[PDB]
Structures are given as C-alpha cells and as structure tokens.
C-alpha cells in the first residue's frame, strides 16, 4: 500500500541464480523459501508498513504442556521479532502454562479446551506443534495467503514414495501419479481466511471418513496434503522451517535450521 523508503542493499543479479542446488519456485509460481532467496530487510519494511499482526497457534494437551516453556522462550528470540505477535495456547491445563516474559507488542492468550475472533485480532495465522523449538530466524518471509512446509524426510523423495493416503475410500486419497510435495502437518499457515477454509475443509473431510469407518494413514497431515494438492499454497517453506537434526543430521542443502524437534 504505502511507499517504501530509500534502502541500500546488494543489487539482484538477473544472470545469477539464488541457489543452484535447490528449486526456489514451484510450477505454479509460488516461491519456495530457502535461506539466500530473500532480503529480510525489504520484507520487514513491507510488512511493518502494514502494521502486520501474526497469530501463532499451538495445542498443548496433557504431557505436552511441558514443552511450552522452551517453545515460547525460543519463539521470543526467533519468531517474527519486530512485529506484533499473538500466541494462542490451546490447552487442557490452563494453570500449567508457564509464565514467559514477552517482548513489547507481543501477547499470549490461553484458551482452555471462536473463529471470528481470529479475523479481528490477527492478519495471519501460523499453526505449529508445541514439542519444537526455534533455533534461528522465522520471520515475515513466510507470510502469504496460504503456505505449506516441505516434510524434512521426503523433500528428496519421488511422489510414489510419499506417505499420502492411498485408499480410494478415504477423502484424503491421492493416487500414485498425483502430488507435488509432501507437506508437514506441523507447520502451515496463511491469512486467517485461508487457514479457516483449510481447517474447515479438513474437519468435514475427516467426518465423512469417520462416518465411512475409515481413518487416513497419517490423519490430519494426510488431509492437509490433499487440500494443498487441490489448492496450491502461495508459498512453500523449505525443510529449514521444520527439521529434526537428531534423526536427519545437517545436510549442506540446509544453510540454517530454524525450527526443530525437541529430542
């Protein structure tokens, strides 16, 4: 909307690829976010001028509430630093949510377990698992109407190898000749409108399957993949955004490990 100010930065090189080791754009022209593909300074400017607010949702039920402290603490250090953030912790133990110190412009809501609420409080929703920790930058470069994340264990696999639901009976069914990538169920987001549409489509699909006495192989993640196949995400995050160093190590292709599993 508003004009950007004068900025000094390296001139993009038209005859010099960002990365020569990875695909940085999908066949439907959505960028694939890898370190080295973006100037965070330009992006921060663009989003700050819109006074962008990001909601981060996590479900911490039962034993998982024990991961909240490390989750929230690292988020404070690496998640959307400089922008307005609203954490939404859905838990069955409200009193167990640790008292974490938050930077200015950042708040936390504990909801014990209305969509409209999100519509008026945030511009984007980022949905992740609680048993994780941020180890590096995760900022506005991910914001877009709809985004999915490349699963750290299948990014180099062929589609036929993907663990999609393969039963024609299930709503999440995806034949062997279809599929772009295998997205993670633990890190997706976008505008509130798009995220609500995705979860609404998923909930309905899961119900239909339940009524037919069937449950997709990888449950929610299976339905997410089916939705993202039929509604292409406007951005795809690389495995940098959700990795497991203990299980997968640190490939050269990953210049940064931003969000990881807690061993």
Ligand X SMILES: CCCCCCO[C@@H]1O[C@H](CO)[C@H](O)C[C@H]1O[C@@H]1O[C@@H](C)[C@@H](O)[C@@H](O)[C@@H]1O
Residues of each annotated binding site for Mn(2+): 129, 131
Residue numbers in the known binding site for UDP-N-acetyl-alpha-D-galactosamine are 59-61, 64, 129-131
Query: Please, which residue, 38 or 155, has the CB nearer to ligand X?
Result: 155
Query: Please, which residue, 136 or 244, has the CB nearer to ligand X?
Result: 244
Binding partner selected for residue 145 from Hg ion, ligand X, none, CB under the kind-specific 5 to 8 Å limit: none
Rounded Cα distance, 178 and 160, in Å: 8
Residues 209-238: x where in contact with Hg ion by CB under 5 A, - otherwise, as a string? -----------x--xx--------------
Would residue 45 show up in a list of annotated catalytic residues for this protein? Answer: no
Rounded Cα distance, 63 and 84, in Å: 29
Provide, rounded to whole angstroms, the least separation between the CB of residue 188 and ligand X.
13
Options 70, 90, 119, 153; binder of ligand X; rule CB under 6 A: 153
- Distant-in-sequence, close-in-space partners of 146: CB < 8 Å, separation ≥ 6: 190, 191, 194, 195, 198, 228, 231, 233, 234, 235
Rounded Cα distance, 197 and 247, in Å: 33
Which is nearest to 219 in space by CA: 195, 177, 186, 253? 186
Instruction: Evaluate whether 195 touches 127 at the Cβ level (below 8 Å).
Output: yes
Options 59, 67, 173, 218; binder of ligand X; rule CB under 6 A: 218
Sign of the dihedral through C-alpha 109, 97, 184, 258: positive
Binding partner selected for residue 229 from Hg ion, ligand X, none, CB under the kind-specific 5 to 8 Å limit: none
User: Which residues are at the interface with ligand X (CB under 6 A)?
Assistant: 152-153, 163, 218, 221, 244, 247, 261
Which residues are annotated as catalytic? 221
């Amino acid at each position: 909307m508003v004009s950007l100010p004068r900025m000094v930065y390296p001139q993009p090189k038209v005859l010099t690829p960002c990365r020569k080791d990875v695909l940085v754009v999908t066949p439907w022209l959505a960028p694939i976010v890898w370190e080295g593909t973006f100037n965070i300074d330009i992006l921060n400017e663009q989003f700050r001028l819109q006074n962008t607010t990001i909601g981060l949702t996590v479900f911490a039920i039962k034993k998982y509430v024990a991961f909240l402290k490390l989750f929230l603490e690292t988020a404070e250090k690496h998640f959307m630093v400089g922008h307005r953030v609203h954490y939404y912790v859905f838990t069955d133990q409200p009193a167990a949510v640790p008292r974490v110190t938050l930077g200015t412009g950042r708040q936390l809501s504990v909801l014990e377990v209305c969509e409209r609420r999100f519509l008026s409080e945030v511009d984007y929703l980022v949905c992740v698992d609680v048993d994780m920790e941020f180890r590096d930058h995760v900022g506005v470069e991910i914001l877009t109407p709809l985004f999915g994340t490349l699963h750290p264990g299948f990014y180099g696999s062929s589609r036929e190898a993907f663990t999609y639901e393969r039963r024609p009976q299930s709503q999440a069914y995806i034949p062997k000749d279809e599929g772009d990538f295998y997205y993670l169920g633990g890190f997706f987001g976008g505008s509130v409108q798009e995220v609500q549409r995705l979860t609404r489509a998923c909930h309905q699909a899961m119900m239909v399957d339940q009524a037919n006495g069937i449950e997709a192989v990888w449950h929610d993640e299976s339905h997410l993949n089916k939705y993202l196949l039929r509604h292409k995400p406007t951005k795809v995050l690389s495995p940098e955004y959700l990795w497991d160093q203990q299980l997968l190590g640190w490939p050269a292709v990953l210049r940064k490990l931003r969000f990881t599993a807690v061993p």
